[PDB]
Amino acid sequence: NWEQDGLVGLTQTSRADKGKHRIGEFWENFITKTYKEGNKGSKRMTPKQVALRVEAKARELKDSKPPNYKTVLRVLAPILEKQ
DNA sequence: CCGACGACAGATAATTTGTCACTGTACAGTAGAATATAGATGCGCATCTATATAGATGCAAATTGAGTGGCCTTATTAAATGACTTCTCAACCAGTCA
Numbered sequence A: 001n002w003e004q005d006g007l008v009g010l011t012q013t014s015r016a017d018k019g020k021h022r023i024g025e026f027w028e029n030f031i032t033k034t035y036k037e038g039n040k041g042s043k044r045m046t047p048k049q050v051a052l053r054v055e056a057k058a059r060e061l062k063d064s065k066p067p068n069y070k071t072v073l074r075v076l077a078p079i080l081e082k083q
Numbered sequence B: 001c002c003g004a005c006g007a008c009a010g011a012t013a014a015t016t017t018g019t020c021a022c023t024g025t026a027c028a029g030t031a032g033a034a035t036a037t038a039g040a041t042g043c044g045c046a047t048c049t050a051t052a053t054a055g056a057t058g059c060a061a062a063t064t065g066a067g068t069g070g071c072c073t074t075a076t077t078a079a080a081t082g083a084c085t086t087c088t089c090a091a092c093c094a095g096t097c098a
Helices: A025-037 A047-061 A069-075 A077-082
Strands: none
Touching: A025 A047, A025 A069, A025 A077, A047 A069, A069 A077
């Protein structure tokens, strides 16, 4: 590793899944769209309100294990940060 | 015989997700509203115009009444009618007769 790369070959290497959520792609897109749509024009929707919409979709899909509030805050984290 | 690399299997923290406990912060009457501007539209009042004159005047026929100018056989007699003029208009004495 020190032959094929610099001192960064003898530091640790971070995992490939760092910054990817383990929840299903449907849920990550649902949370992303729900937040963005909830803010069109004058509306101002908080992550907690998004989490309630997640729970409402979970009842429709009969999903016994939807993303919880902390997972919604993490999914929206970079979206709030860029801003 | 020694060193380096790949296959397969095994153990491991980073990553993501979930749960749990402590916490900063909004709820407290409140931004639709004030103050300029241009730009278009409409009602009112004045200021012209173009038409429409009837009354007055000048003139030129069209008679119309009122003028004026130019052209014409004559002399005797007789009768008739109507007129004019002139003249005249004494009175008793002297000589017969039945």
